[PDB]
Design a protein around this nucleic acid. Structure first.
Ligand SMILES: Nc1ncnc2c1ncn2[C@H]1C[C@H](O)[C@@H](COP(=O)(O)NP(=O)(O)OP(=O)(O)O)O1
Ligand SMILES: [Mg+2]
Ligand SMILES: [Mg+2]
Length: 418
DNA sequence: ACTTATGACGT
DNA sequence: ACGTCATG
């Protein structure tokens, strides 16, 4: 019934903003965004504080536009090195967080600001230690129970406590429900440890799988955690849009909506697994049939380290690189940042990348990557990497350079122990 | 002219 | 191996 494991998803609240606000006290408790490349339209927003969201400011907005919605908006710029954005500060901030999470349980780095946790084992330990002890409300100061309260509240904290009381009073409530509660107690502790040790606040979702735990985390932001039990799923999914569920945000979800003629996740229950398979594939049908019943089996991978390391730049419109000299210069600029990142990787993580991937895009092409080619990554030399990368894409030139290049991408892959 | 990184799947 | 999809 997918009530076998306890899985959590922890996600930092407006991460890049918190990172800047910690370092610059002035930006704290104020409408705040983080931008990059100020020259064109004040730059592009990649992170918005909650105060700034009250005014309607969103990521992928122009800073000049954001200022129109929010006159008093404070802006922080991404560091620029070698003529491109540099995310080093946010990656180091990430490492602090990932390290604190590691002490509690085994984690899967899902993004720079979020990881999954498997609390299944930890829950078992706590119960033996905690055996015969009731769970106090004090143990869950920031926990929301989805679907509660019900029955017999005007303030949001009042609703939270009321729901928490009903759930705790029942714990009536099964063995898998008790495990989620202990799972959540542990998440309270882990979240408190993050803020105390780094100054960063965050939200969390606690459930039986990664899809639900991720959905749960969203429900109460920021600085709150949410438990989505097995029993809540039917009511929660019933009015829940398909696009909301992870991996249904793009084309597949659209085709499910278009083919099946439904709009909510719950509506999938009526169809047989075979029906779903025939429409959307064997792998997807099977996945859909279980997910709408709240059952998901993807494992929490024990991976704290990124599989791959890469850098890229985009040369939109006029700025597009139409000469051999420019292509050579930016590969070198990219290869140089890559070398710094790669060297650090070896010292911290005892591993080396064996392959190098070059991806490029050209004018008139929609696709993120027009093409990609690879070659051997034998040495961490920016000049060699840049020179080799030129060699594997040099043919690409139809011609000077034609067509001019929209983007350059260099990626390191295939790391091995050492 | 929403950029810059990531991971997984299909074939 | 190379393209594509999905996500942050
Ligand atoms: N499309 C994008 N392009 C570039 N950088 C991005 C990005 N999306 C996110 N980032 C960077 C900047 C972001 O701060 C960060 C975290 O990812 P989120 O969790 O998706 N968003 P946040 O933590 O800001 O807040 P909250 O979760 O509470 O809504 O990654
Ligand atoms: Mg976040
Ligand atoms: Mg996130």
């Amino acid at each position: 019934t997918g009530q076998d494991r306890v899985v959590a998803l922890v996600d930092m609240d407006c991460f890049f903003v918190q990172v800047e606000q910690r370092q610059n006290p002035h930006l704290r408790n104020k409408p705040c965004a983080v931008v990059q490349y100020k020259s064109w339209k004040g730059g592009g927003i990649i992170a918005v504080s909650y105060e700034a969201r009250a005014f309607g400011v969103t990521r992928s907005m122009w800073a000049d536009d954001a200022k129109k919605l929010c006159p008093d908006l404070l802006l922080a710029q991404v560091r620029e090195s070698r003529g491109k954005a540099n995310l080093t500060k946010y990656r180091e901030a990430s490492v602090e967080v990932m390290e604190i999470m590691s002490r509690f349980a085994v984690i899967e780095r899902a993004s720079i600001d979020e990881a999954y946790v498997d609390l299944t084992s930890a829950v078992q330990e706590r119960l033996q230690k905690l055996q015969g002890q009731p769970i106090s409300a004090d143990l869950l100061p920031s926990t929301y129970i989805e679907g509660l309260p019900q029955g017999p509240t005007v303030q949001k904290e009042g609703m939270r406590k009321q729901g928490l009381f009903q759930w705790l009073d029942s714990l009536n409530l099964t063995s898998p429900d008790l495990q989620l509660t202990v799972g959540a107690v542990i998440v309270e502790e882990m979240r408190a440890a993050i803020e105390r040790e780094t100054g960063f606040q965050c939200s969390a979702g606690i459930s039986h799988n990664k899809v639900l735990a991720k959905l749960a985390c969203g429900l109460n932001k920021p600085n709150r955690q949410t438990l989505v039990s097995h029993g809540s799923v039917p009511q929660l999914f019933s009015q829940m849009p398909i696009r909301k569920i992870r991996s249904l945000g793009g084309k597949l979800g659209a085709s499910v909506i278009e083919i099946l003629g439904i709009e909510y996740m719950g509506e999938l229950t009526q169809f047989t697994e075979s029906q779903l398979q025939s429409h959307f594939g064997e792998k997807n049908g099977s996945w859909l049939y279980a997910m709408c019943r709240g059952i998901e089996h993807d494992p929490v991978k024990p991976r704290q380290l990124p599989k791959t390391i890469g850098c890229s730049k985009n040369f939109p419109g006029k700025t597009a690189l139409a000469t051999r000299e420019q292509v050579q210069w930016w590969l070198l600029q990219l290869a140089q940042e890559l070398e710094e990142r790669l060297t650090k990787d070896r010292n911290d993580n005892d591993r080396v990348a064996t392959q190098l991937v070059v991806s490029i895009r050209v004018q008139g092409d929609k696709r993120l990557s027009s093409l990609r080619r690879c070659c051997a990554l034998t040495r961490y030399d920016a000049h060699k990497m840049s020179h080799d990368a030129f060699t594997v894409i040099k043919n690409c030139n139809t011609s000077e350079w034609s067509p001019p290049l929209t983007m350059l991408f260099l990626c390191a892959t295939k790391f091995s122990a050492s």
